[PDB]
Design an enzyme around this catalytic site. Structure first.
Site, PDB file in Angstrom:
ATOM      1  N   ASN A  74       0.827  -1.209   0.000  1.00  0.00           N
ATOM      2  CA  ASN A  74       0.000   0.000   0.000  1.00  0.00           C
ATOM      3  C   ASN A  74       0.875   1.279   0.000  1.00  0.00           C
ATOM      4  O   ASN A  74       1.854   1.353  -0.725  1.00  0.00           O
ATOM      5  CB  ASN A  74      -1.035  -0.025   1.140  1.00  0.00           C
ATOM      6  CG  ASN A  74      -1.767  -1.359   1.237  1.00  0.00           C
ATOM      7  OD1 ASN A  74      -1.646  -2.083   2.251  1.00  0.00           O
ATOM      8  ND2 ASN A  74      -2.551  -1.684   0.216  1.00  0.00           N
ATOM      9  N   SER A  75       0.582   2.240   0.882  1.00  0.00           N
ATOM     10  CA  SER A  75       1.239   3.559   0.810  1.00  0.00           C
ATOM     11  C   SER A  75       2.674   3.555   1.276  1.00  0.00           C
ATOM     12  O   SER A  75       3.352   4.531   1.086  1.00  0.00           O
ATOM     13  CB  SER A  75       0.467   4.596   1.644  1.00  0.00           C
ATOM     14  OG  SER A  75      -0.722   4.957   0.980  1.00  0.00           O
TER      15      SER A  75
END
Length: 252
Positions: free
Chosen positions: A57-58
């Site tokens: 993800n981020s």
């Protein structure tokens, strides 16, 4: 994709200590890994689960930032990007950004704009050289957000430590600019650097991360917490990291 894309199997050729942080994790499930520079040693809670590969993800925005610096998509005199005027649910996203603001607020469009300027062959070369998880770029879109690219909790620490600490082709000023963007907390005792990551599937948290590092007066520690169930958000993974680093004496 392959038989090996969900799991990191490479032995640690390193001193390692098994931790029991089950009380702090509570009803949540996942792992915690820390590496100490001075000790050259890994400290691992839930070693099996630390080797399971999940979408970063981020937390991959760490690498998009490094790649954007290395390719001069952004620099030191200018890392500014104008808003394209599309309305997002958070007002922090609805304006001009620099690397600092975009990293702090996990502003997706900033990093998507960077990723679109990077040719697939550069990224593939980089993930290979960095040993970044399954190295699977898939359709090469937002390939780091619940998509083909996966990495384990153990690899998050190993890869970040090696990227920052080895003399590679990434310059020292790019490393320093990345670090400033990742600074969360600084006092007399420590500097804490890091990046949350949150995966959402059908309105539910499915995947929580916090990957970073701590500098003290005596040592430097890279760490990562991954949450796979319970309440698996980046914010929760960050909270869990802070309690564990504090119990371990890293923050004092």
């Amino acid at each position: 994709q392959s038989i090996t894309d969900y799991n990191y199997k490479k032995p640690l050729h390193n001193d390692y200590q098994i931790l029991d942080k089950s009380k702090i994790f509570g009803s949540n499930s996942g792992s915690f890994v820390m590496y100490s520079m001075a000790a050259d040693a890994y400290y691992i809670y839930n070693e099996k689960e630390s080797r399971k590969r999940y979408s970063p993800n981020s937390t991959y925005k760490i690498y998009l930032a490094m790649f954007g610096l290395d390719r001069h998509i952004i620099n030191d005199e200018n890392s500014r990007m104008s808003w394209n005027h599309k309305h997002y649910p958070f007002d922090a996203w609805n304006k001009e950004q620099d690397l600092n603001t975009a990293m702090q607020n996990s502003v997706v469009w900033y990093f998507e704009r960077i990723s679109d300027q990077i040719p697939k062959n550069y990224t593939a070369t980089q993930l290979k050289q960095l040993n970044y998880g399954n190295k699977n770029l898939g359709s090469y879109k937002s390939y780091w957000m619940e998509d083909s690219l996966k990495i384990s909790n153990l690899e998050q620490v190993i890869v970040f430590k090696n990227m920052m600490e080895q003399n590679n082709h990434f310059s020292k000023k790019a490393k320093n600019q990345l670090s400033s963007s990742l600074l969360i907390k600084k006092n007399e005792k420590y500097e804490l650097y890091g990046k949350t990551g949150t995966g959402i599937v059908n309105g539910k948290y499915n995947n929580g991360w916090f990957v970073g590092y701590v500098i003290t007066n005596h040592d430097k520690y890279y760490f990562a917490t991954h949450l796979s169930d319970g309440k698996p958000s980046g914010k929760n993974a960050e909270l869990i990291s802070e309690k564990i680093l504090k119990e371990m004496g890293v923050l004092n």
